[PDB]
RNA sequence: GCCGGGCGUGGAAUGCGAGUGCCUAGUGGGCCACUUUUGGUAAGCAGAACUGGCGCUGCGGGAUGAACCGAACGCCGGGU
RNA sequence: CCCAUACCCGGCCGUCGCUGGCAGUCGGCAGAGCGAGAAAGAGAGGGACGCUACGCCGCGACGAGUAGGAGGGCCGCUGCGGUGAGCCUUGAAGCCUAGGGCGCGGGCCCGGGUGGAGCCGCCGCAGGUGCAGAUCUUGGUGGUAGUAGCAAAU
């Protein structure tokens, strides 16, 4: 007999994409090889993100990557995002970028290439930068989903500014007793 | 049809399954509950911190120069260690070359 | 019995709704009958416009 | 003077008897096929001494000799002559077995075809 | 009464009282909770000072013996097994001990 | 697809995933939102605060079409017109401002959330916010009301 | 409260990868023992505290045995 | 001195971990290597096997389990879209079996017998899909048992 606990000896993590998309699985074949036989820890980050679910690789706005590229120690490196690059309409100017994304929306492609930019795919990135040298690995806002407003401490708890689940918002949908000091109490 | 009233029999064992973890320590703890008069003024001290910015960089430029001219005004047995010096891979290369002539 | 966290749902299924369920399996047949009646009308008033006044 | 396999390892089996369902002897309605007992009081379910054994993964056969016939081959069901030409390179390790419902006139078109490709057949002279 | 004897740290100071952050164990979870206690029920903890004192000699014996080069031990070490020594029995010889006989007290 | 559901795996297990002690009975807590104030009080106060009670005035015959007023922020004000207009306005040296009629696009009120590119406009709207006007003027445009 | 700079022998021992978020079933009749302990003449009684058990658990021993003593279990050979 | 499923050594199975290794099968356009305690370059001026990569391989540690949860089923049933130049009156389904075997198992494959007209494999899809129990439902058959009994009114 051994005095251990097998409660959490099985680490929960993705070892392969749950998707059956063959183009994604071809990229995984490519980066399983790169992450294994290069000491570049960049490839292990990109590989680990290819497995992630859709909600774990959120879209990256075009303005967010314009903004994260105006930083000083930059202006030449490649922008790598494992998710997708949506277009942002509230941005006016577009500098010339060097982008490598899994998926780029139609209006973002036309807007990036119009500015003399260049869009790469991860099969091209591996040829240009096998070890990921000269790249800027970006990520979309992961907690940007509307779901995370419902998470955390439950509502009706002191200083728990958590959005409740209501079928509709209005004056007669959870504006009463638990919320007004006039009606019982509030938090 | 009575029953057990209260017990804490298995509770200590239940508490330690996921551990009794101390609260999450974190530098920069919140300022909720602090005296409003002290807090109100403390916010004014931040509101006008930029007023003395030119004084800051000016006194900071001379402060790095102060130490600049400062430092520039200033600027178990031998048998086993002998063998360990030969057995070293890098700094023993010129040492284990007499051995090449030893068998010759 | 509400579980941990959710919405307060009010499904209007307390009457005898199952006796008055209208299914739409005739929908493709209705679209055909409508079109045939629409073309039959256009042929009856042939030179006049099909849409009407 | 038959076809000999590539290698003839010693087949070791951790158990040879079947696993019979609990109380399959006492009743006729209870067939022999194994079902894990789930009664709250069941003797077999909680490993009492001297009871019916329960099938564990520990009884698993050695991977090197799994599915291996006593002859040293591994079966492969075939339905026609065309399904033999796939065993042309798995010769020394896999044997062919003609399916049950294959007619008797077609068996004498497979047994002699398999004799040309040197493919061992488990049930050569079946119908006759 | 569940804080009498506990030790915390001050985070807010008013005219007559201070705010303290104390750890209170509540059924398998610890809570760092805030209380406002008036000065009379308060002492300075001398548990931290012996560390503060030890920091001084560590900061003293570091700048010292650096230019001397002598590497002086800084970390505390548990009570080691005592060394080998000689016990002198000059003159006297060890007196004999024998259990006294029993005699009913009451 | 019933072949993937949980009941396919529960065949042979007596209680069918509902336990032996606390059997799967009909309605152990009442039907629907019962006991919201009595034995489900904690759930309703921990996850639906404000559920019980009355608040505010009643509006008997409410027509949503009267309070219809879709808004648009200044950040995407330039997305209503084609890009050809936005580039010919800066290219133009006369100083003629293009006209952006929001009510034609489908909005009534203009809110000043974003930053505007520095080139004049003529925003035709039904309502304005104070910041929206102040930003338009700062760029050099004009706020034209319509009804 | 802000900036800026300098200090690393990582400042007791031992051990060990941690942190964090969702969704969530069953359960909400318990029982027993060492020690402490309340009512009771007492109880294989009623009620608590602490830890460990039984329940959910076979196995060696106590002839027998829910709980005691030893020891916890994939399928086997040898040893102890 | 005796022996437990405990401990030690060894075999095998599985799980977990190393988020381990393998695209280098780099061949007369050839040169056969990365087990090595020590930040980093064998740098230029005719030849077995293999690698369904969802594969293959190597090390370690570990394995009780009700209620409950999850995964994997080349487990099983029925129908549908594809596919097998599939099977079948030279005998399908079904049923029987002291026959031969495979799988830890769910189960399955052969042989023999009976039978007389349809059936199955694989990739997907769909579900009225798996029984020992419910004083379960319907049907059938036992033991009791050649027993109780076939004795009111001459």
Q: Which two tokens stand for residue D76?
A: 């492969």
d(CA A159, CA A187): 6
Number of neighbouring beta carbons within 10 Å of residue D22: 20
Distance from C-alpha of F117 to C-alpha of F139, rounded to nearest angstrom: 7
Phi, psi (rounded to 5 degrees) for E56: -65, -55
Q: Which residues of B79-103 are buried (b: 16+ CB within 10 A; e: fewer)?
A: eeeeeeeeeeeeeeeeeeeeeeeee
Distances (CA, A) of A174 to A79, A166, A168, F51: 45, 8, 10, 4
Q: Using what technique was this structure determined?
A: cryo-EM
Task: List the D58 CA – H74 C1' distance (angstroms).
Answer: 21
Tokens 């849409």 sit on residue? C51
Please choose, from the candidates A172, A179, A176, the residue with its C-alpha nearest in 3D space to the C-alpha of residue A157.
A179
Among A155, A177, A182, the strongest candidate for a mutation testing the F interface, having the largest count of F CBs within 10 A, is: A177
Q: How far is CA D14 from CA A124, A179, C17, D62, in A?
A: 54, 69, 62, 9
Question: Is the separation of the CB atoms in E18 and E45 below 8 Å?
Answer: no
C-alpha to C-alpha distances, A150 to C1, C18, E4, F36, F127, nearest whole angstrom: 21, 35, 39, 21, 34
Distance, in Å, from the CA atom of D42 to the CA atom of D40, rounded to the nearest integer, reads 6
Between CA D51 and CA D42 the distance in angstroms is: 10
Resolution in A: 2.8
Residues A44 and A35 sit within 8 Å (Cβ to Cβ): yes
- Contact yes or no for A17/A24 (Cβ under 8 A): yes
**Contact predicate A118/A98, CB 8 Å:** yes
- Measure the CA angle with vertex B67, ends B63 and B68; round to 5°: 100
**Closest listed residue to residue A171, CA positions, set F111, F65, F62, C5:** F62
Residues A167, C5: C-beta atoms closer than 8 Å: no
CB atoms inside a 10 Å sphere around CB C3: 7
d(CA F74, CA A83): 29
Structural contact between residues F58 and C17, judged by C-beta atoms closer than 8 angstroms: no
The DSSP code for D44 is G
Q: Which are the residues after which chain C is interrupted (C to N > 2.5 Å)? A: none
Chain C closest-CA separation from residue A145 CA (Å): 18
Could you tell me which residues come within 8 angstroms of residue F94 by beta carbon, excluding any fewer than 6 positions away? Answer: none
| Residue A166 near residue A173, CB atoms below 8 Å | yes
D55 contact partners, CB below 8 Å, separation of at least 6: D19, D34
Closest chain F C-alpha to A186 CA, distance in angstroms:
8
CA dist A156 and F48 (Å) reads 7
Instruction: Give contacts of C8 with chain F, Cβ < 8 Å.
Output: 33, 48, 51
What's the rounded Cα separation, in Å, for the pair B18 and A5? 12
Task: For strand H, give the nucleotides within 7 A of a protein CB.
Answer: 5-7, 11-23, 37-40, 53-54, 61-64, 66-73, 75-77, 85-93, 101-107, 109-112, 118, 125-127, 129-130, 132-133
Q: Tell how strand E9-13 and strand F99-101 pair up.
A: unpaired
Q: Say if CB D108 and CB D73 are below 8 A apart.
A: no
- Helix, strand, coil in percent for chain B, rounding step 5: 55, 0, 45
A166 contacts C7? CB cut-off 8 A: yes
In angstroms, the CA F44 to CA F47 distance is 6
Residue at token pair 């406009």:
F121
Task: Name residues whose C-beta falls within 8 Å of residue A88's C-beta, 6 or more positions apart in sequence.
Answer: A61, A62, A63, A64
Show Cβ contacts of residue D85 under 8 Å, excluding neighbours closer than 6 positions: D117
Task: Nearest chain D residue to F15 by CA: give it.
Answer: D38
Computed over its alpha carbons, how large is the radius of gyration of chain D? 21
> How far is CA A133 from each of CA A35, A40, A66, A73, A127, rounded to the nearest angstrom?
14, 9, 20, 14, 12
List, in order, residues 6 or more apart from D12 with CB less than 8 Å away.
D62, D65
Residues contacting residue B100 through CB under 8 Å, at least 6 positions apart: none
Residues D23 and D44: their CA atoms lie apart, in Å, by 10
- Residue A57 burial (10 A CB sphere; 0-12, 13-18, 19+): buried
Answer whether F73's CB lies under 8 Å from F112's CB: yes
């Amino acid at each position: 007999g051994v005095d251990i606990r097998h409660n959490k000896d099985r680490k929960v993590r993705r070892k392969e994409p749950k998707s059956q998309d063959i183009y994604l699985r071809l990229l995984v074949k490519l980066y399983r090889f790169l992450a294994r036989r290069t000491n570049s820890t960049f490839n292990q980050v990109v590989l680990k993100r290819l497995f992630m679910s859709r909600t774990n690789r959120p879209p990256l706005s075009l303005s967010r990557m314009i903004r994260k590229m105006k930083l000083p120690g930059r202006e030449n490196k490649t922008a790598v995002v494992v998710g997708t690059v949506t277009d942002d309409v509230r941005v006016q100017e577009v500098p010339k970028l060097k982008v490598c994304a899994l998926r780029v929306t139609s209006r973002a492609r036309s807007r990036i290439l119009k500015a003399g930019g260049k869009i790469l795919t991860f099969d091209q990135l591996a040829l240009d930068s096998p070890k990921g040298r000269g790249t800027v690995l970006l990520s979309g806002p992961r907690k940007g989903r509307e779901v995370y407003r419902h998470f955390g401490k439950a509502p009706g708890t002191p200083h728990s500014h958590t959005k409740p689940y209501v079928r509709s918002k209005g004056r007669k949908f959870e504006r009463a007793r638990g919320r007004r000091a006039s009606r019982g109490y509030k938090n | 049809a009575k029953s057990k009233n209260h017990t804490t029999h298995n509770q200590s064992r239940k508490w330690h399954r996921n551990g009794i973890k101390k609260p999450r320590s974190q530098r920069y703890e919140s300022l909720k509950g602090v005296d409003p008069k002290f807090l109100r003024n403390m916010r004014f001290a931040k509101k006008h911190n930029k007023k003395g910015l030119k004084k800051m960089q000016a006194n900071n430029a001379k402060a790095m120069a102060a130490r600049a001219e400062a430092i520039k005004a200033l600027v178990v047995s031998r048998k086993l260690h002998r063998l360990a010096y030969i057995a070293h891979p890098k700094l023993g290369r010129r040492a284990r070359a007499r051995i090449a002539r030893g068998l010759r | 019995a509400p579980s941990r966290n959710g919405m307060i749902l009010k499904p209007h299924f307390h009457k005898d709704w199952q006796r008055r369920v209208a299914t739409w399996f005739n929908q493709p047949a209705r679209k055909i009958r409508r079109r045939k009646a629409r073309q039959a009308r256009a042929r009856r008033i042939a030179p006049r416009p099909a849409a009407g006044p | 003077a038959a076809l000999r396999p590539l290698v003839k390892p010693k087949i070791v089996k951790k158990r040879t008897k079947k696993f019979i369902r609990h109380q399959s002897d006492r009743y006729v309605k209870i067939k022999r096929n194994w079902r894990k007992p789930r009664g709250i009081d069941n003797r077999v379910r909680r490993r009492f001494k001297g009871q019916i054994l329960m099938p564990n993964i520990g009884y698993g056969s050695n991977k090197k000799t799994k599915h291996m016939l006593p002859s040293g081959f591994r079966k492969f069901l075939v339905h026609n002559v065309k399904e033999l030409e796939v065993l042309l390179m798995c010769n020394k390790s896999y044997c062919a077995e003609i399916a049950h419902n294959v007619s008797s006139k077609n068996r004498k078109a497979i047994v002699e075809r398999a004799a040309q490709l040197a493919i061992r057949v488990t049930n050569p002279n079946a119908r006759l | 009464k569940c804080y009498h004897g506990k030790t915390g740290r001050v985070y807010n100071v008013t005219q007559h009282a201070v705010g303290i952050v104390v750890n209170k164990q509540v059924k398998g979870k610890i809570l760092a909770k805030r209380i406002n206690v008036r000065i009379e029920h308060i002492k300075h903890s001398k548990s931290r000072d012996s560390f503060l004192k030890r920091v001084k000699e560590n900061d003293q014996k570091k700048k010292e013996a650096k230019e001397k080069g002598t590497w002086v031990q800084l970390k505390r070490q548990p009570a080691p097994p005592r060394e080998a020594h000689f016990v002198r029995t000059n003159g006297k010889e060890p007196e004999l001990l024998e259990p006294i006989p029993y005699e009913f007290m009451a | 697809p019933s072949r993937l559901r949980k009941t396919r795996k529960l065949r042979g297990h007596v209680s069918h995933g509902h336990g032996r002690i606390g059997k799967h009975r009909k309605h152990p807590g009442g039907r629907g939102n019962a006991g919201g104030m009595h034995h489900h009080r904690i759930n309703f106060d921990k996850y639906h605060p404000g559920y019980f009670g009355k608040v505010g005035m009643r509006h008997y015959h409410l027509k949503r079409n009267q309070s219809f007023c879709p808004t648009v922020n200044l950040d995407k004000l330039w997305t209503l017109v084609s890009e050809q207009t936005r580039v010919n306005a800066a290219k133009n040296k006369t100083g003629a401002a293009p006209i952006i009629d929001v009510v034609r696009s489908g909005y009534y009120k203009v809110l000043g959330k974003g930053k505007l590119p520095k080139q004049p406009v003529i925003v035709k709207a039904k309502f304005f916010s104070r910041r929206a006007e102040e930003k338009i003027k700062g760029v050099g445009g004009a706020c034209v009301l319509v009804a």
